[PDB]
Amino acid sequence: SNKISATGVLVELDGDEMTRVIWKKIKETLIFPFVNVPIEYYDLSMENRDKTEDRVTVEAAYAIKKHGVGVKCATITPDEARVKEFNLKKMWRSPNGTIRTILGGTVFREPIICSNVPRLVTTWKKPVVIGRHAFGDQYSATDAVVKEPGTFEMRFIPANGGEPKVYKVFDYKSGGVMMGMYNTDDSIRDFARSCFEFALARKWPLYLSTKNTILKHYDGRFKDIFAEMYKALYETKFKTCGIFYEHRLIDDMVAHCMRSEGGYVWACKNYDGDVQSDSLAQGFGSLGMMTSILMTPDGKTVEVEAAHGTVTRHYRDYQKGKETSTNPVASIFAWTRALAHRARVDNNNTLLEFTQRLEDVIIATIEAGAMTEDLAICIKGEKNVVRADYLNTDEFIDAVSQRLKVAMQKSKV
Amino acid sequence: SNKISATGVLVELDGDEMTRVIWKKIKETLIFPFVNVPIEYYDLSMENRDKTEDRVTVEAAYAIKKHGVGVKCATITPDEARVKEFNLKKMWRSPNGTIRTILGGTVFREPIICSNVPRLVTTWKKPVVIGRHAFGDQYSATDAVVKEPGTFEMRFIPANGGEPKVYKVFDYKSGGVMMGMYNTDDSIRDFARSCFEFALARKWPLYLSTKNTILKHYDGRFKDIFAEMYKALYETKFKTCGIFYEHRLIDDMVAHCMRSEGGYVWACKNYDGDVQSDSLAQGFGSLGMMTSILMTPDGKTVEVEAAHGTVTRHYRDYQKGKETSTNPVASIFAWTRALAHRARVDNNNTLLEFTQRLEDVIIATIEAGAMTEDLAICIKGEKNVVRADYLNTDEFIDAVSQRLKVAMQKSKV
Ligand SMILES: NC(=O)c1ccc[n+]([C@@H]2O[C@H](COP(=O)([O-])OP(=O)(O)OC[C@H]3O[C@@H](n4cnc5c(N)ncnc54)[C@H](OP(=O)(O)O)[C@@H]3O)[C@@H](O)[C@H]2O)c1
Numbered sequence: 013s014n015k016i017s018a019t020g021v022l023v024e025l026d027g028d029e030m031t032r033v034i035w036k037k038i039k040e041t042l043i044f045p046f047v048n049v050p051i052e053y054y055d056l057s058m059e060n061r062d063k064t065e066d067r068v069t070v071e072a073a074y075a076i077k078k079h080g081v082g083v084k085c086a087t088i089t090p091d092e093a094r095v096k097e098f099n100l101k102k103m104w105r106s107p108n109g110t111i112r113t114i115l116g117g118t119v120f121r122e123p124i125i126c127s128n129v130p131r132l133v134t135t136w137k138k139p140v141v142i143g144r145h146a147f148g149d150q151y152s153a154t155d156a157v158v159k160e161p162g163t164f165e166m167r168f169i170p171a172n173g174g175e176p177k178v179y180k181v182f183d184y185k186s187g188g189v190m191m192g193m194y195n196t197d198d199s200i201r202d203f204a205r206s207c208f209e210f211a212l213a214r215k216w217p218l219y220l221s222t223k224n225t226i227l228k229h230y231d232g233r234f235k236d237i238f239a240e241m242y243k244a245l246y247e248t249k250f251k252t253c254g255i256f257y258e259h260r261l262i263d264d265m266v267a268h269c270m271r272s273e274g275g276y277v278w279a280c281k282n283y284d285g286d287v288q289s290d291s292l293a294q295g296f297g298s299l300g301m302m303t304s305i306l307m308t309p310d311g312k313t314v315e316v317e318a319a320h321g322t323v324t325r326h327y328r329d330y331q332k333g334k335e336t337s338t339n340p341v342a343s344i345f346a347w348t349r350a351l352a353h354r355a356r357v358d359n360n361n362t363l364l365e366f367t368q369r370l371e372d373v374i375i376a377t378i379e380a381g382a383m384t385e386d387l388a389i390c391i392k393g394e395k396n397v398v399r400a401d402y403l404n405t406d407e408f409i410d411a412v413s414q415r416l417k418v419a420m421q422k423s424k425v
Numbered sequence: 426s427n428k429i430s431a432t433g434v435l436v437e438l439d440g441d442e443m444t445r446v447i448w449k450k451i452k453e454t455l456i457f458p459f460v461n462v463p464i465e466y467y468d469l470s471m472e473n474r475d476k477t478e479d480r481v482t483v484e485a486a487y488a489i490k491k492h493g494v495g496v497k498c499a500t501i502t503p504d505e506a507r508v509k510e511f512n513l514k515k516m517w518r519s520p521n522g523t524i525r526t527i528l529g530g531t532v533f534r535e536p537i538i539c540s541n542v543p544r545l546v547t548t549w550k551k552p553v554v555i556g557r558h559a560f561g562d563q564y565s566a567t568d569a570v571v572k573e574p575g576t577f578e579m580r581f582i583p584a585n586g587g588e589p590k591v592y593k594v595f596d597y598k599s600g601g602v603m604m605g606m607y608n609t610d611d612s613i614r615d616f617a618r619s620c621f622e623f624a625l626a627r628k629w630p631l632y633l634s635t636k637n638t639i640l641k642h643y644d645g646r647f648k649d650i651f652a653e654m655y656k657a658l659y660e661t662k663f664k665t666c667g668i669f670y671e672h673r674l675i676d677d678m679v680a681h682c683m684r685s686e687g688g689y690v691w692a693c694k695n696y697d698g699d700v701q702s703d704s705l706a707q708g709f710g711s712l713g714m715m716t717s718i719l720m721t722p723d724g725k726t727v728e729v730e731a732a733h734g735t736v737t738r739h740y741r742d743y744q745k746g747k748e749t750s751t752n753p754v755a756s757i758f759a760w761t762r763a764l765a766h767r768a769r770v771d772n773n774n775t776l777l778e779f780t781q782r783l784e785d786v787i788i789a790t791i792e793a794g795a796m797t798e799d800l801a802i803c804i805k806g807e808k809n810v811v812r813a814d815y816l817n818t819d820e821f822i823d824a825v826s827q828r829l830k831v832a833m834q835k836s837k838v
């Protein structure tokens with residue numbers, strides 16, 4: 013027992029506005045005093061990204077790839093309002109798009125549950141983790157309105173000599189609408205891999221949802237590639253570990269989500285993931301009670317972040333000297349979930365114990381009535397909430413620092 | 426004072442198995458003792474359809490078109506198993522789909538709430554009525570698997586012999602998947618007309634969900650057709666009733682559902698209607714507490730039925746001595762909602778009155794503690810259920826029948 017000292021290192025992406033502020037409080041108060049982790053720092057503030065012609069962002073991604081883990085603070089993505097504000101050379105791409113592109117992989121969203129902060133769904137006791145496919149179906153599609161009266165025909169034209177195959181879709185008298193969409197086995201397969209690695213690392217069962225009763229070929233491909241991946245590479249490791257993989261109908265699975273206790277990973281196609289993730293987010297509680305984790309298809313590499321933005325509104329108050337009650341636990345959990353993968357890879361059970369301890373201590377802090385404004389709101393209603401009911405960001409972080417201390421001291425020699 | 430009568434006519438489709446039993450019982454007990462109604466009968470028992478080549482189903486559907494109101498009991502659909510049970514004829518199409526094709530219009534599903542039967546979603550205080558488009562999109566699409574390299578290409582081919590449009594969807598390098606789908610302006614427009622009329626007849630606001638952020642042309646059309654129709658034909662009448670029409674992104678809208686108290690109509694595209702209805706089914710409680718109402722686009726013709734099927738496993742159970750406690754209120758509410766529409770068309774206030782009474786009364790009875798097995802388990806759980814806690818089918822129907830005598834009676838001296 014001394015500062016922990018992991019073998020491998022963590023890649024830290026600093027961000028902007030309110031999250032950078034609390035990110036600093038989190039490091040100084042909750043992490044570095046109790047753990048001795050080697051960091052590789054990269055500053056993804058909007059200033060340094062412009063200054064460097066968005067180069068930090070690329071080198072942050074590659075450093076994540078070499079080290080295997082990265083925590084990442086929320087980051088402003090440029091629009092036209094922000095080019096004027098920050099005086100930007102060009103409208104730089106969203107750092108999340110940039111990093112994902114480079115790393116590849118699939119985002120999984122994990123909520124954080126306390127007993128005293130109720131969910132909107134009375135059955136939910138464990139987390140339901142959605143993993144979204146996120147490489148095109150309707151998101152890479154080609155649509156057009158039909159104004160004339162004509163016929164919609166699909167074609168596949170082999171790259172070799174082979175004969176065209178032509179599909180007669182429909183015949184328009186009055187107007188209408190037409191669409192085409194695609195996916196690739198390479199993307200489906202890599203999605204399945206991330207899901208399987210994710211489920212195995214979390215020791216949770218995995219479900220895939222499709223609508224292969226109606227899209228027999230299109231969704232049947234989804235179902236088949238997952239079944240190929242399971243049998244070949246994962247069934248055994250899953251059985252050993254007390255978990256399983258199952259394909260279900262999207263209809264079945266949204267009812268299962270309503271009905272069930274939770275405790276599973278749920279693989280969703282692009283669209284379903286978009287739609288159902290909003291539903292689940294709402295159901296579980298505040299945006300400050302969920303993290304996003306990108307896992308690569310080999311399962312070796314991981315980027316973790318809070319499932320919210322930089323919370324600009326609360327940054328406008330911080331700048332104007334007002335005290336602020338932004339919920340920090342998504343950010344703190346991003347650090348524990350990051351360090352947990354580090355420890356797991358490195359086989360550093362000591363560090364693992366720290367992440368568990370910290371997460372556990374946060375959950376108790378809230379359960380004893382010490383929480384931020386958003387969470388008081390959930391419990392007591394949008395009104396019945398006075399300043400005394402909640403803590404501000406930093407005195408909340410201090411309240412868990414105090415509770416981490418008690419717990420942190422242990423086995424003193 | 427003796428009975429209540431109406432000039433207009435009610436079509437009745439009678440069905441089969443357990444629902445057919447219940448159907449008979451609620452007529453004799455709850456509606457005929459208080460109502461003289463013109464009523465044209467069609468028998469949709471699986472035998473009578475086989476016997477009559479499925480023509481009674483097409484006759485029943487056209488009679489509802491003529492008269493404006495039908496009540497339907499659940500019907501067996503043909504599988505390979507079902508041909509042998511009754512007598513083999515042919516693999517006959519489902520009655521619902523034939524009636525739905527004949528009538529046009531959109532089905533709207535309405536849950537029945539009581540204060541003492543909790544929903545899985547804490548926020549739901551009012552019904553959220555999903556109306557599902559039910560033509561096109563994924564359910565009449567053309568999909569296939571790509572195994573060679575080559576090119577996915579869409580062509581629109583004007584019927585006049587004009588210049589065809591060629592879209593260039595994707596060059597596959599490894600295998601993958603392809604899909605083409607359509608909808609028509611006519612169908613989207615008729616769907617829009619049902620939604621505006623249904624929501625107006627019920628005095629609820631109306632939401633459309635699309636993903637027009639991504640399918641700018643495909644989903645944009647749904648948005649544009651709804652908008653242009655609201656401005657032209659409905660906005661005045663909605664403002665006059667104190668309701669509104671609003672387009673929402675499908676992500677925002679499923680989130681809205683989770684946190685809203687309800688009291689609105691929700692227009693869903695085919696797929697979204699399919700998926701989100703099952704989510705709602707599980708959320709609102711028993712399948713015996715929800716009706717379906719098909720409303721044609723002119724707003725004048727309605728077909729109403731229970732949301733569940735024939736209840737086969739209560740029927741095989743049925744009367745081998747073995748009694749049952751099937752929930753009949755979805756079946757009862759099918760009559761009240763039909764008769765309500767009958768009255769509203771007729772300007773027959775005394776019949777409208779009667780529909781409201783029997784509804785209020787059924788709710789009151791269940792809030793009293795008299796309810797079928799299904800509802801008893803909801804209040805708390807399979808283990809704590811004994812027969813002290815609930816009533817059988819005939820007994821519950823009688824319990825409301827006696828409670829109904831006292832209601833109508835509040836005519837005084
Ligand atoms: N990972 C990322 O890099 C990421 C993701 C999303 C958005 N963003 C960026 O963040 C900036 C702001 O975008 P946005 O306002 O749309 O998203 P946001 O930062 O999540 O803020 C939206 C609102 O959600 C509530 N909220 C969010 N986090 C909270 C917390 N920890 N505790 C309590 N309440 C919280 C606040 O509502 P009230 O003000 O009503 O309290 C807040 O104003 C943009 O520049 C956007 O591009 C970044």
Ligand SMILES: NC(=O)c1ccc[n+]([C@@H]2O[C@H](COP(=O)([O-])OP(=O)(O)OC[C@H]3O[C@@H](n4cnc5c(N)ncnc54)[C@H](OP(=O)(O)O)[C@@H]3O)[C@@H](O)[C@H]2O)c1
Pocket residue numbers: 498499500501502521712713730731732733734735736737738739750751752753755799
């Ligand atoms: N046209 C229609 O309206 C329609 C719709 C769907 C299905 N069907 C047809 O009906 C037949 C059987 O359908 P199915 O077994 O798939 O669904 P179902 O008849 O609705 O029965 C499904 C199960 O749900 C429970 N349940 C359903 N309704 C109930 C009620 N009113 N009260 C209490 N419990 C209820 C029962 O389980 P417990 O006994 O364990 O409670 C029942 O076995 C099939 O031939 C099918 O094609 C017709």
Ligand SMILES: O=C(O)CCC(=O)C(=O)O
Pocket residue numbers: 519521522559
């Ligand atoms: O297919 C649908 O849209 C509804 C299911 C149904 O009731 C039927 O088709 O018989």
Ligand SMILES: [Ca+2]
Pocket residue numbers: 285286287289290676
């Ligand atoms: Ca979304």
Ligand SMILES: [Ca+2]
Pocket residue numbers: 263699700702703
């Ligand atoms: Ca369904």
